[PDB]
Amino acid sequence: GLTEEQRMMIRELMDAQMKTFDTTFSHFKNFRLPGVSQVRKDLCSLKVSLQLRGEDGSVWNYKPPADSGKEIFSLLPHMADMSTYMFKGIISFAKVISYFRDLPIEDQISLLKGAAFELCQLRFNTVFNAETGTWECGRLSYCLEDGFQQLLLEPMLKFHYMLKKLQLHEEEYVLMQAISLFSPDRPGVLQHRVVDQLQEQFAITLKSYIECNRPQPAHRFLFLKIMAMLTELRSINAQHTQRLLRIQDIHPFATPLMQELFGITGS
Ligand SMILES: CC(C)(C)c1nc(-c2cccc(NS(=O)(=O)c3ccsc3)c2F)c(-c2ccnc(N)n2)s1
């Protein structure tokens, strides 16, 4: 069984998640849409078509082009708007958690800058349909273009399929978010020991939750698999930060919030 402090910790994380995760994406609006050397390699990894289902029942569908000049950039303003919406939710999530509110403001900033991408991807995994290869974001859908084995070569995509296969509960997703947010080794963190102890507590709570609620042979080593996925997600984070910085170098597109989170100064 979980201790009372562990149950309290899960309840606080679950409360934060329900208050700040717009799972129907109902408040995502006014976003941009595509017009009616190494950077080229970066942009060709994630090929998705886009579908918008109107409230009236109409459907708009967008297929992207092939790498033939600037057409490589057509989906960037939209994805920047979606990422920014997601990041705002992640910041709200962190800010309503007491363990986070109690850290120095500078460490709050450093932890969010370290983890925003990772928590965004963890939330996106919960709307991933692995059978159809689509992220279902309310009236918006992102569908992977046509194989499956070739798609698992891209580390982000393999991440989403492998995490979805673990069939996690909401509670395990929110503890993954907590363990990623409270990483004591993000650059600029001052309360290294406080953050390390918090992270350890969240990981212990996760290990115990799995021990108490998941007896099936399929869930053996589940805790260790989850921690391996978090390590992989940190590596994916570093790689995509580099991709973003290269693209932004050649073709500015980051929103103000993305600039803040990725360290771009405006000069
Ligand atoms: C929502 C899904 C999971 C479908 C996506 N997720 C990213 C994604 C990938 C990497 C990073 C981010 N976030 S980020 O760094 O602020 C950013 C925003 C625009 S470039 C970088 C993402 F949202 C996508 C993306 C980004 C750019 N092009 C294309 N074709 N797909 S599709």
Rounded alpha-carbon distances, angstroms, from residue 23 to 51, 85, 125: 17, 12, 12
Q: What angle do CA 244, 248, 254 make, to 5 degrees?
A: 85
Probe ligand 1: pick from 42, 46, 122, 126, max atoms within 8 Å of CB?
Answer: 46
Report the separation in Å between the CA atom of 214 and the middle of ligand 1, taken as the mean of its atom positions: 33
DSSP-assigned states of every residue in 156-186: HHHHHHHHHHT---HHHHHHHHHHHHT-TTS
Token pair of 177, please?
A: 């978010």
Report the separation in Å between the CA atom of 203 and the middle of ligand 1, taken as the mean of its atom positions: 28
**Nearest ligand 1 atom to alpha carbon 247:** 20
The residue nearest atom 11 of ligand 1, judged by CA position, is 240
158-197 burial, b for 16+ CB within 10 Å, e for fewer? Answer: ebbebbeeeebeebbbbbbbbbbbbbbebeebebeebbee
Token pair of 158, please?
A: 């393999």
Strand partners, 60: 52
Q: Binding site residues for hyperforin, as ranges?
A: 83, 121-124, 240
Closest CA to 82 of 20, 158, 157, 140: 140
Q: What angle do CA 39, 41, 42 make, to 5 degrees?
A: 65
Please give the helix or strand (H or E) that residue 30 lies within, else none. none
- The CA distance from 41 to 37, in Å, is 7
- The CA distance from 177 to 94, in Å, is 9
Distance separating the N- and C-terminal Cα atoms of the chain = 54
- The CA distance from 61 to 125, in Å, is 22
Evaluate whether 111 touches 181 at the Cβ level (below 8 Å). Answer: yes
- The CA distance from 48 to 59, in Å, is 16
- The domain spans of the chain are 1-267
- The CA distance from 66 to 64, in Å, is 7
- The CA distance from 219 to 167, in Å, is 10
- The CA distance from 130 to 1, in Å, is 32
Q: Binding site residues, as ranges?
A: 83, 121-124, 240
Token pair of 135, please?
A: 């992220």
Evaluate whether 191 touches 103 at the Cβ level (below 8 Å). Answer: yes
The residue nearest atom 13 of ligand 1, judged by CA position, is 83
**Nearest ligand 1 atom to alpha carbon 64:** 30
Reported for 166-170, long-range contacts at CB under 8 A and 24+ positions apart, including other chains, are: 166/222, 166/225, 166/226, 166/229, 168/226, 169/213, 170/14, 170/17, 170/126
Radius of gyration of the chain measured on its C-alpha atoms: 19
- The CA distance from 14 to 21, in Å, is 10
Report the separation in Å between the CA atom of 259 and the middle of ligand 1, taken as the mean of its atom positions: 15
Residues with Cβ within 8 Å of residue 118, at least 6 apart in sequence: 180, 230, 233, 234, 237
**Ligand 1 pocket: which residues have CB below 6 Å?**
46, 48, 75-76, 79-80, 83, 117, 124, 135, 142, 240, 244, 258
- The CA distance from 225 to 163, in Å, is 9
The residue nearest atom 3 of ligand 1, judged by CA position, is 124
Closest CA to 89 of 257, 226, 242: 257
- The CA distance from 67 to 43, in Å, is 9
SS3 241: helix
- The CA distance from 216 to 195, in Å, is 33
CA-CA-CA-CA torsion sign (190, 87, 255, 252): positive
Report the separation in Å between the CA atom of 83 and the middle of ligand 1, taken as the mean of its atom positions: 7
Rounded alpha-carbon distances, angstroms, from residue 190 to 109, 110, 184, 194, 199: 11, 9, 9, 9, 15
Evaluate whether 159 touches 225 at the Cβ level (below 8 Å). Answer: no
Torsion angle, alpha carbons of 152, 21, 80, 237, to 10:
-50
Counting beta carbons within 10 angstroms of the beta carbon of residue 244, is it exposed (0 to 12), middle (13 to 18) or buried (19 or more)?
buried
**Nearest ligand 1 atom to alpha carbon 258:** 16
Residues with Cβ within 8 Å of residue 228, at least 6 apart in sequence: none
Probe ligand 1: pick from 46, 79, 140, max atoms within 8 Å of CB?
Answer: 79
- Structural determination approach: X-ray
